[PDB]
């Protein structure tokens, strides 16, 4: 052994243990999710209130890339910020040469290739985040999830972090109960509920809900934060279902 002491080393069963250990940091993070709706995507995340002294609404976690893409992650927050900074550079350079804003699948591969690059050498460490991201491009809505290995796929809904199992089952019900699809507004409400449900595995502390969305009809295909009345209404709808 000693195969797990250095990134990019294959174990005798063909595994990269440092990547698997990165996944442990992810599983240790707060719960974050995304829901692909009819003409858009919704992102939501649980923010643990470690103390009264945290200024409410003020430690924003969901991040925009360009103007049409939202990103949320669980695990090591700084690693996620590093990945989004890179994503912002990739988006800028794509738009600079090709004019059109980067399509979501194209953007997914840019993040994927970069994250995968950090599994090729022992001089770097894998990313300790799983990232849920997406938005609207010329072919419609797209939701993706990307892991520390560089692995990503497109999703109907996605979840990561500590309450991932609970969120998944919730997400599966929605897929079954709505083959035609979910409206963006329905998706916001559902997202609030699922984060409330998943917060059981994290019940020690209270939390603060944070939601965002990009919808062709509701935001003109731009990424926006769900604030004020529409946020409250989703918090209320969530409170009801956990009661």
């Amino acid at each position: 052994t000693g195969y797990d002491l250095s990134n990019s080393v294959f174990s005798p069963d063909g595994r990269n243990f440092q990547v698997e250990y990165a996944v442990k940091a992810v599983e240790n993070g707060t719960t974050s999710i995304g829901i692909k709706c009819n003409d858009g995507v919704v992102f939501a995340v649980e923010k643990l209130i470690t103390s009264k002294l945290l200024v409410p609404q003020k430690n924003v976690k969901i991040q925009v890339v360009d103007r049409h893409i939202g990103c949320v992650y669980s695990g090591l927050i700084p690693d996620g910020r590093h990945l989004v900074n890179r994503g912002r550079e990739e988006a800028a350079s794509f738009k600079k040469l090709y004019k059109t804003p980067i399509p979501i699948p194209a953007f997914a591969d840019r993040l994927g290739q970069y994250v995968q690059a950090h599994t090729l050498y022992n001089s770097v460490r894998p990313f300790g985040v799983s990232t849920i991201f997406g938005g609207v491009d010329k072919n419609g809505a797209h939701l993706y999830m990307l892991e520390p290995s560089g692995s990503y796929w497109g999703y109907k809904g996605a979840a990561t972090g500590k309450g991932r199992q609970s969120a998944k089952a919730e997400l599966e019900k929605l897929v079954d109960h709505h083959p035609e699809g979910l409206s963006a507004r329905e998706a916001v409400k559902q997202a609030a509920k699922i984060i409330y449900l998943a917060h059981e595995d994290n019940k020690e502390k209270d939390f603060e809900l944070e939601i965002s969305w990009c919808s062709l009809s509701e935001t003109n295909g731009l990424h926006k934060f769900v604030k004020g009345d529409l946020l409250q209404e989703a918090i209320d709808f969530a409170q009801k279902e956990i009661n």
């Binding site: 080393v9 294959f10 174990s11």
Partner: protein
Amino acid sequence: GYDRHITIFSPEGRLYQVEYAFKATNQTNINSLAVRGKDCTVVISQKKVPDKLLDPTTVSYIFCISRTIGMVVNGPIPDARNAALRAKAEAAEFRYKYGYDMPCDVLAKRMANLSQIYTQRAYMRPLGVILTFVSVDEELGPSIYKTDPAGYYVGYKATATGPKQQEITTNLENHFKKSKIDHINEESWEKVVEFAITHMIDALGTEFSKNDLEVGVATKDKFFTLSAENIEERLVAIAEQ
């Protein structure tokens, strides 16, 4: 025991990191197979979407490298996409510099050389993938060339890759021993696809619905993948005879 961690020789002249990269190649538990027609080259691969939250249209191990070249990969998707991006870059650059489309066998050689380098240079790890390149080459005709983590490559009459490659391989060998020709003697690619699926069914002893397969077809001047519905139409024709 550090000769196990990086690509240096063990006392028996072995490269363990390369051997373990071959082992990673089967981690997706997917089998693929490729055969040649008179005019076409067909590749099929099992498709497994084990999670209902997945968008199945985004789950794929078949890649359109250039207009004329397709690639199926056996191995984890991050390494697969690394290889796919590189192969796309190399094919485009080749056309820019030399004024003609990169041949399937030349791309395979190039990707095999890159792989050879990872087995000799310590700072790079091998990619845990096997790459099967297909086209209908303008000089060589229907072509299958396959690369592995040792930097080995060779052309094939037909080939198979994955956990159950041996069963498929022996099944294919038995057919070609019989027919005594290097290819499926069929006019249409539709029939070459049906042949390919049929012999995978026999060899794995399992049946397929339209969502259990992935199919790629190379013809003169293009490579394309089939939709679930084109595959359904294939399956139907197989059952009705």
